[PDB]
Amino acid sequence: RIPLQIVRAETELSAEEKAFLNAVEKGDYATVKQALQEAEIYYNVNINCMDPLGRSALLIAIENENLEIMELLLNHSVYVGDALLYAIRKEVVGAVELLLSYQFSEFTPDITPIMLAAHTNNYEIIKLLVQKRVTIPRPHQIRCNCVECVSSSEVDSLRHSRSRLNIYKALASPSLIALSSEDPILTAFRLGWELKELSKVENEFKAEYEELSQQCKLFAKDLLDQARSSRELEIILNHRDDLAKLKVAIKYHQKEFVAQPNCQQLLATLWYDGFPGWRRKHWVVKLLTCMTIGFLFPMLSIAYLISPRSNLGLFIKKPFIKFICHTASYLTFLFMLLLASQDLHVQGPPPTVVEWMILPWVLGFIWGEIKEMWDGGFTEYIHDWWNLMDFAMNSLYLATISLKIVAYVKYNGSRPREEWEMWHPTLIAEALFAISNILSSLRLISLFTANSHLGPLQISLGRMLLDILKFLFIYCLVLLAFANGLNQLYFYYETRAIDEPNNCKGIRCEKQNNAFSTLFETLQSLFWSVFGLLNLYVTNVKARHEFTEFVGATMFGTYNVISLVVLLNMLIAMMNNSYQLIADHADIEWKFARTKLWMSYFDEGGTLPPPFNIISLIQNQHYQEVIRNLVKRYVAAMIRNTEENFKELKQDISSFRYEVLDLL
Amino acid sequence: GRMLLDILKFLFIYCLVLLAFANGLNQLYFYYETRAIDEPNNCKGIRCEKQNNAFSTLFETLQSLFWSVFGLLNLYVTNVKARHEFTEFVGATMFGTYNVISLVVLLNMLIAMMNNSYQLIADHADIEWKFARTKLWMSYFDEGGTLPPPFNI
Amino acid sequence: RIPLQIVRAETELSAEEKAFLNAVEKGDYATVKQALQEAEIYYNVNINCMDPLGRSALLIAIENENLEIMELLLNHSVYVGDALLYAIRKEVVGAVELLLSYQFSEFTPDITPIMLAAHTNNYEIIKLLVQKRVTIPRPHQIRCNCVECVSSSEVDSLRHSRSRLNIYKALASPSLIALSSEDPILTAFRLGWELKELSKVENEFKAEYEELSQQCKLFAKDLLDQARSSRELEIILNHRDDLAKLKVAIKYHQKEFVAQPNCQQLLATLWYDGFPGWRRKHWVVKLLTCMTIGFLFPMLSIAYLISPRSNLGLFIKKPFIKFICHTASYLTFLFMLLLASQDLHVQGPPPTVVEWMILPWVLGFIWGEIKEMWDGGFTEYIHDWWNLMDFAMNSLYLATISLKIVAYVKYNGSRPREEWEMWHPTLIAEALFAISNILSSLRLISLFTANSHLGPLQISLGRMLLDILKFLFIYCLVLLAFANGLNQLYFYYETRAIDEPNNCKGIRCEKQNNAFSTLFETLQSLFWSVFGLLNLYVTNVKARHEFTEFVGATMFGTYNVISLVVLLNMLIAMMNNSYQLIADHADIEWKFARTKLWMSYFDEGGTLPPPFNIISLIQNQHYQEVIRNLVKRYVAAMIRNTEENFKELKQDISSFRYEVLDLL
Amino acid sequence: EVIRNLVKRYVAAMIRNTEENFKELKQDISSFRYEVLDLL
Amino acid sequence: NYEIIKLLVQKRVTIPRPHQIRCNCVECVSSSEVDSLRHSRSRLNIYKALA
């Protein structure tokens, strides 16, 4: 038998106090008034007594939305501490008004009335409290190192984090941004960015800051949604303190704001500047138009070079035409790259016709990269993540040019390639040019963003490359482990190349041999074993060491089971899970990426593709009027868009019953 | 670590099927076992350049069927010097049945098992990692074991 | 401009009729009574007038749960047709009572009050209507061919199917089975089975019959759940009209009823007859006990053979001990099968020691199979789906024995195997024995049901084999297509075996050749190409027919892309989808299969494993009392377990308001 | 005729098939309370 | 809402006809160039009403 008692005892109520609290709960005004008037004279009932749940008479009256009993208790001067917080959390406007006109707590000490109202996101109570001059303390820098911040963190790191989270919950309230904010959209953008940075910094409190940032982004998107005309939309997007605010939204990674259907419609209308009816056209018509504009890109470039002010000179400045011209230029460059591989004994030969036509494109690519670096800046250049591949391409092309020049000025004779040096400059130049061709042909992935059916796919692939990068670390660890083991076991039986059947040593011979004789060769053997191109007889030695052969073959089999069976299916499961997490947001991400791609063609700089590139207070008032209209519409829409309801209904019915019984 | 349990569950059935087919192929092929001297390079087994005697013994049959999962077992091992075409076809069809059961059925089945088991850990992955990392942190809170090897001796 | 009018016009109401209907809707009793009394004299208002929604005054009064206005309208003799159906569908007991005491329709003509009450599954109204002698028409046979059924189907196949579905919805009601049913559990079982058969037969109306059968199964499971003691449970399971009703539930595939935790507890208590505390034991203790009982299975079998009445004679009759003994016997059989492969030039040799010890096991297996066929019957034998593998094993073993006998009595000399005939009886016997060994070793899959961690897995694999069978048809179609094509292209260049390097022809040689020379060899080449064991040089001919070689290689590549890339990943997706559909029900399916496995060991027949096998009205009254208790408990539990509620609240408030205003 | 029957049946079936409800209930209760207090 | 829709259809009320999906009249292009947000919103509202 387990005895049950009250381990943490409290002060029980008397019979009269319990009767008074029950009368307050039932809403009987007459009995409560009589009890108060009698407590004034006899002092037999404590009006500030709690209940077994901790609520007092005032808290019970607030929870039941009984304004009459609330006012009756307030007129008798009951304890009122923290009652405003309970009235605000209950989201009852009349109670808040009555408390503005005049121990254990469910609210933390740092909670203030305005902060709690912002937490509740109730426009009425927030506006009530903002009518009075109320103020939220300013949060310090995300990485602030002042004496006050470190002192508060060392004294109490739980109180400090809780206070910061409460302040950022108050500031991130959509109703508190609709009011008391000069620019709600820019405030929402900055607040979302700062909350994302705090989520990055605060690891434990990450989900809350993430959801607050997402709430701010959704607030900005809904504010943009309330626009009802193109004039208002272009006033919003072009406000600067064109498309300045849209560029700011792109800077703060506001994907929901950018992917707005109206914003995307405006961007598409700007994108097809020359063609007014591109939206309603057949597939064959669009294909023929694109092919015709692409085949005429040198004519358009030359017309822009000669006279920019003409029917053909400024025709390339249109964003879609500019994109088509750049794509056609890159396609011709890749076609010449394909032609390049179509005497070969010359040591350091002069460049051929195809290479002489390739050189202008390489120079134009390098000049365009350095011009983008000089104009846009450094951070914008490194934020692209495609300028890395462009830098690799340009560096490899420059190395190819340098090695070609060196081999031309250091060699004159025509010696057959069979007796050339392994590190001959021509060979290194050819290898670097082949790698550069691979990279240049792979550079066409960035054009999948301009397509409707190839954009979300590319976004999904970019997002799934992160799971592959995560799996690559563990795969490489296992690979290094097994390579070290097999090398340690097999390096004793290394044989010279002359002893091999065809003077060939390694796994790239017809008969593979010395697969695990060195660390590098062991790494390559275990890499090629993933694809099955490593034969099983490589785990063999000429000596009759059957135990060593079996141990090596079993190491090989263990590596096969770990990589091909465990790691590969594990990576498949990882990618399968990661893809479903992008299925929903694929369209918004693609629209943001395509918006960036479109905005990249809106500038006057870089108009000519290679190789032709080497040859005012009314605004603020209009924006404020539009913002006022948007705020009104958004407040109305959000207003238009449990047991407490039934409890309020029961309280009303009981109060009406008691007053009818008293009247009759 | 949580997906290794599904692999351990699949390993039992895979090993049962492997033992079954190994016993069958051994029972069928152990009559045609040839000495190592008769082999082209005095090498007997599946680790030679020309694989031979792949199903001549239970151990060698197990290893041949293990390596057949990764495709490193050539098809001409299901051959005999005699003109027993029926026996050769029956052995090759046992081999093909084992291939279909393991590579096609069992492997995709294991993939589906791991795919289902991963989604069941997606939600609780953070809490499990935080518990494991808490244990790792508490392991370094003690005075014992302060000096790493070889300074501890 | 699109003009909008009333294409299907109706008869509009007058002002007085609309006012009367509005007074009925608002619940004002006085105005409605005055309107009725005035319509009696002046005949100015039609009391049977509809509304723009088709409802009359009586229907409006029923929908608002206004019993006073309902009775007032009934006393004035308003039209009452089909009002009982609306009162039943509304699930208002008082309205049904008032209508029992006394045009367009929302109910089909075949709907009757008792049928609609059964559809609503309302115990109160169903009992009300069953108090009166009410009757549901009997549905005919699922495959009935009488004149009435075919006549009704040919005259109106929509009315007939609807009537059948309504009748089966009425009969499958849990409340209508709680009442008016001698045995609710057996009725639920039979009804679920018949609804499943109808779902199989009625393809268009499949989901409805499936959900009705599932509802009946859940009703039976919940009736079993209401048991509160082991006595009641064993009374239910052992009722026969032991474990007779449990065997009936197993026969009707009642997986939810079988997998009941209490039923499974009783079955486990019966399963561990000898061990009372097997539930609370360590892993090592259970393992040692199982190993000890398995190593002593011949002693237990011999003790049962000599004296069944002893501490060891009847110790094997315990179900768990019997299962352990049979498993140990099969394990020893497989161990001897493994020993079997451990002079060989004898044509038709006599059996060795291992085969002489194997023969008793084979004879015992055959005798056990034929004894199961003779005892259980034919349908039960073919329902197992494992007796197919047992039949294959026994047929192959019998063929092995026959071929061994023939080779022994037809050959005496010792000729080396190299010069033996291709179809020598010894070779066929050895091949059949190897196939039999494969099948016998694969027979251990059926023992995974007895394990907790291996049972649901085996169920999932059995359920995923159906998707593989579905994919096999399309794979074989594509395989046959490409095999026919490659054969048609390549059969001209077939070369003799002597012309081959080692007198070897086919793909099983060291150098593969003639891979697509015949239909059979083409099928095998394309089969082995799935696993990559078919080399690429087989798509080559000695002649310089480069076009033919390229066309054949491209057929091969197309087949590779279709099978390995498309079909294989498609099958992976199929199995991945099919597995999640079994994840939820895996435990119940495993528990049903394990219950069947346990019940298989409850019989006296087949006690000895191979090779030792070849050497009363109180019951119904108790069951009825238990069933009455269960029905009461289930009705109470189901009773314990939208805009119409708010509409009823508003109607009550408005009626009270009007009556208060009239009184004052 | 068949289409008219179908339209009637569909309208009836669709008719047969939040805070504003509670607000309407509270409004009705408050109005009844005020009118009772005024009458008494 | 069937009741209110029928109420308003009792009076002769009329919804403007949407033009062709690929219409190229002067009115459509003028409305699209003047305000492409108001035009799309009006078309969507008309097609929500008709559907």
Ligand SMILES: CC(C)CCC[C@@H](C)[C@H]1CC[C@H]2[C@@H]3CC=C4C[C@@H](OC(=O)CCC(=O)O)CC[C@]4(C)[C@H]3CC[C@]12C
């Ligand atoms: C696929 C194999 C045969 C290699 C072919 C290389 C190129 C000829 C392909 C590869 C990627 C293709 C590009 C993928 C994406 C687009 C976007 C597309 O733009 C649109 O979708 C129209 C809508 C718009 O951009 O306004 C223009 C064609 C283009 C450049 C494609 C042109 C043809 C490209 C360059």
Ligand SMILES: CC(C)CCC[C@@H](C)[C@H]1CC[C@H]2[C@@H]3CC=C4C[C@@H](OC(=O)CCC(=O)O)CC[C@]4(C)[C@H]3CC[C@]12C
């Ligand atoms: C896995 C490789 C090495 C082949 C081994 C073959 C056998 C030695 C294995 C294969 C399947 C195993 C069986 C799988 C299932 C079970 C159920 C198990 O029963 C239980 O789970 C205890 C609970 C109960 O049955 O009451 C008894 C062991 C047994 C027969 C196992 C015994 C060992 C078996 C026969």
Ligand SMILES: [Ca+2]
């Ligand atoms: Ca760039």
Ligand SMILES: [Ca+2]
């Ligand atoms: Ca059987």
Ligand SMILES: [Zn+2]
């Ligand atoms: Zn600070």
Ligand SMILES: [Zn+2]
């Ligand atoms: Zn009939």
Ligand SMILES: [Zn+2]
């Ligand atoms: Zn128009």
